[model samples]
Structure formats: structure tokens, C-alpha cells
Target chain A: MRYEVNIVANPNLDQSQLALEKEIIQRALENYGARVEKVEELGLRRLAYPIAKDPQGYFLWYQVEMPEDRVNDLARELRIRDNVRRVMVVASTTPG
Target chain B: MRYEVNIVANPNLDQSQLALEKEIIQRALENYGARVEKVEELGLRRLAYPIAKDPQGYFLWYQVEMPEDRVNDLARELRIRDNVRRVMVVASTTPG
Candidate 1:
């Protein structure tokens, strides 16, 4: 099944750390058998409200196709990561 | 504190039900002493993956100003609603 995932990272990360952050997420998704289609960088923005006491976050939105059963596992893994503040996985209407 | 709230409602709801859903949200905010600044309707779209076995949802985006302490209370209330499939409240960078 196809899904759109939004990952919000700690805004304090430096450039290198940011790149590493993406790599970690990408690797996890791939390991879970997810085919990532596209990524949208939302850049740094102040969240509408604080998350984990952080006023801002760097957002990465992903379009992915993966098995239905594994979606929750991926979300759970991402959620538990210290750097990942928020993880949202929603179904996408756009045809893959 | 202020927030940008995104609500994904079940797509199975008809037009009237959608309106009611929004009303519920608006009322929730008002009851919580939240000042709703703006609302954006993202319409219906297929999710990247199904939520509650729902393939699609009607999206509503809300810009609200409220007490930092009450945010979690609001999120919890929205999450428990039968018609609300997903609720994401993030801190916004945009000045009010």
C-alpha cells in the first residue's frame, strides 16, 4: 500500500547531522520494504506549538509504497528515535 | 502559545457531516479558550496509507492561539473522536 509520511526532526541539528538524519530514516524505510517515491523538504519552521519543548523543527515529507502491515512498525521505530519529534504516516490518494 | 493543527476526518462523511466535523473542532477550540486564527480545507485525498482502514480523508488545517498547557488536552479530545482519523498539532513559525 502507498503512504505519505511526514517526519519532523530536531531543528538544532547541523547540516551534517541533518543529512545523517535523513539517511537513518531512509535506511529504516528501505529495511521495512518501503519504496520511497519522492521527498519534499519543508525546511525549518516554528511548529504551531512546541513538540518535546522545541519551538521549531525541520520537516521532511515522504511518498512511499510499502506493505500495509509494516506501516505501524515504521512509525513506531521513527517515533522512538530521540531526534525524531513527530512521525505521521497517512495514505496518499495520488496514484503511484 | 500558538499552533497549526491539521485534522484528517473520515472521508465517508458526507458534506453535512464534514461541516459538523468542523463545527466540533471549532467548538473544541473555543471551549478550550483557543483562538482559532484560520482554517484551511485540504478537501479529500487518498492517504499514503490507510488509517483506521480508511483509504481517504477530508483534511482541515487550523491556525490557533492557545495556552501551551492546554494543547495536549485538545489533541487528546480530537484523537478520541470517532470521525477524526488523524490530528496533528505543530508549532507555527508564522507570527500571529
Candidate 2:
């Protein structure tokens, strides 16, 4: 199964923090038997609303293929991370 | 043929600008014989790079189906607009 996930992270973090968080997340995906096709880091921008008392977020997009049943578990891991502010997952209807 | 188009537009524009842009785009789709299945405004978010010197964009997504030959015309129309920054079209394989 393939999933397209987008993330909005705390914008206040510097480049190093941003890199660390992404490194962990991407590695987690690989460890879970997922293949990441695209990982884009969208630089700082204003937010739709104040998130964690800040009016901006750093955006990242990931398109990955993984076993169908591991989505919830993967999301759970992301939710517990302190640096992550928002996450969305959309499953592709594209067939193999 | 169906196209899932995602657009990133200038974020500094007010609500009226957003509304007018969407209205015109949707009407264009209908006038071209396309059926719009989903239209979502993702509010405001940051950019991968400074597009036209702006760091943020108002996002919109449309999932629509239309005759195959009409796409080039629709895309050309969008490309000429100054406010629209990014547009991506992905064809779906789902059957009616």
C-alpha cells in the first residue's frame, strides 16, 4: 500500500533540529519495511492558525509504500514526537 | 480522464481574492465540461522556496474529470494567471 503524508512542524526550530527530526522519521519508515519515494522539505511559511502558540510551520511531504496494516502504528509513533505539529495521511487508490 | 490538481497561490491576498480565484477556476472547469468532485482550500502554508519573493501560499486541491483533449487548454489558462504558483495534475485509473 502507498500513502502520501504531509507534515507541519514547529517553525521555530533551526536547520539542525529540522534535519534531526526528518532523519528519525525517515529511518523509522525504512525500519518498518516502507519505501519512501519522495521526501520534500518545504521551508518556513505562515500558518493557517496559531499552532503551539506559533503562527508558522515548516512543511514536509512524504510519499511511501508500506504494508497495509502498519499505518496506524506509524502514525502513533509520529503523534508522540515533540517536534511534529501536524500530520495527514492520504492513501492512494492507484492499483499495483 | 480525471485530474487531481493541487494549486499553491499567493498567500498575501485577502479573502475576496481567494474566493474570486476559486469561483473563476471552478466555473472554467464546468464550462469546459469537467465535473468537479472535490474542492478543498487548505488555507495557508509555507513554500519549498521563495516563489515570486513570497514564502507562503494558500493551497487548493481539485479532483475533476473531463474530456482528455481539454487538459492542455485548462492548464494553459492557469499558467497565465499570476496568483497561481504551483499546480500538479495526477490522472486517476478508477472507473466510473
Candidate 3:
């Protein structure tokens, strides 16, 4: 199934750090046997509210084809990474 | 603080019903002394996973300048509305 995964990175991560950030997410998804169809770095934006006391965060939106059963597991794995602040993996309706 | 509120509506709500859905959100903010800065309809998209067994949903993203404390309450209020499937109020850095 195609999914919309929005990743909000911790405020301290700068533009230069984004590559490493993307690499981490890519690695995690592949671990679960998922292939990413589209990836977009939505640049920097502040959270609607402080997340873990941080004022702003960077964003990465992904269109991924992933297995339904491993969705929750992937979120947990992504969250534990130091650079990631929030992980929202919503199933996508966009056709494959 | 300005917030980026993303309200994903249930697929059952058609395009015509959005006005009332927006009305519900607009009214709730005023009760808390907040003002909406901007409103954008992001249209429909599928969830990354089935939310309460629903496959796809509509989207509304808001630029609301509101007091920090009331944010949670507003989220609570937004969540209870039947037409809304998901409510995400993230503090935003979008310029005014």
C-alpha cells in the first residue's frame, strides 16, 4: 500500500544535516522491505506547538509503497533515531 | 504563536460540506481569543494506514495565530467533530 510519511526533524538539524537524515529514513524503510516511490524535503518550518520543547523543525514528506503489517514497527524505529522529532505514517490513497 | 493545523476530514464528507466543517473550526478558535491568519484546502489524500478502518480522507490546513495554552484544547475540540478524521495542530513558522 502507498503511504504518506511526514517526518519532522529536531530543530538543531541544519540544511547540511538533511542528507544524513534522509539516509536514515531510507535505510529504515528498506529494512521493512518497503520501497519509496517519492521523496520531498519540504524545507524548514516551525511546529504548530513546541515538540519536546523545540520551537522549529525541518520536514520530509515521503510517498512510499510499504507493507501494512510493518507500518507501526517502522514508525517506532524511525522515532528512536536521534535526528527525528516526529513520525507520521498515514496510509496514502495515491495510486501506485 | 502561529499554528499549522491540518484537519483531515472523513471521506464521507463531500466538497459541499467543507464550509460547515471550516465553520466549526473557525468558531472554536474565536472562543479562545485566537485569529486565523490563513486557510488552505489541501484536498483529498489517503492515510498512511487505515485510521479507524477508513481508507482515504480530505484535508484542510490552517494558519492560525493563537495562544499557546489553548492549542491542546482546540485540538480536543477539533477531534470531537464527527466529520473530522484527524486533527494535527503544529506550531508554524510561516511568515505573516
What C-alpha lDDT do the candidate models reach, one value each? 0.79, 0.70, 0.76
**Higher-scoring candidate on TM-score, 1 or 2:** 1
Task: Note the residue pairs that clash in candidate 2.
Answer: none
Expressed as tens digits, the lDDT of each residue in A1-96 for candidate 3 is 777788888767666787787888899889888898988876667655324466567878887887778898888888888888778776645442
DockQ of 3: 0.32
Q: Which sections of candidate 2 miss by over 4 Å?
A: A49-54, A94-96, B1-24, B28-96
Task: Judge candidate 3 at residue B85 and give its lDDT.
Answer: 76
- Top-TM-score candidate index: 3
Q: For model 2, report DockQ.
A: 0.04
Off by over 4 Å in 3: A14-16, A49-52, A93-96, B1-5, B10-19, B22-58, B62-96
Which segments of model 1 are wrong by more than 4 Å?
A49-53, A93-96, B1-5, B10-12, B16-57, B61-96
lDDT of 3 by residue, B1-96 (tens): 877788888766755788788888888878877898888876666655324466567878888887778888788888897888778777655442
**RMSD, one per candidate, in order:** 6.1, 14.8, 5.4
Task: Compare the candidates by lDDT and give the number of the best one.
Answer: 1
Compute DockQ for each candidate against the true complex: 0.24, 0.04, 0.32
Q: Estimate each model's TM-score.
A: 0.58, 0.50, 0.60
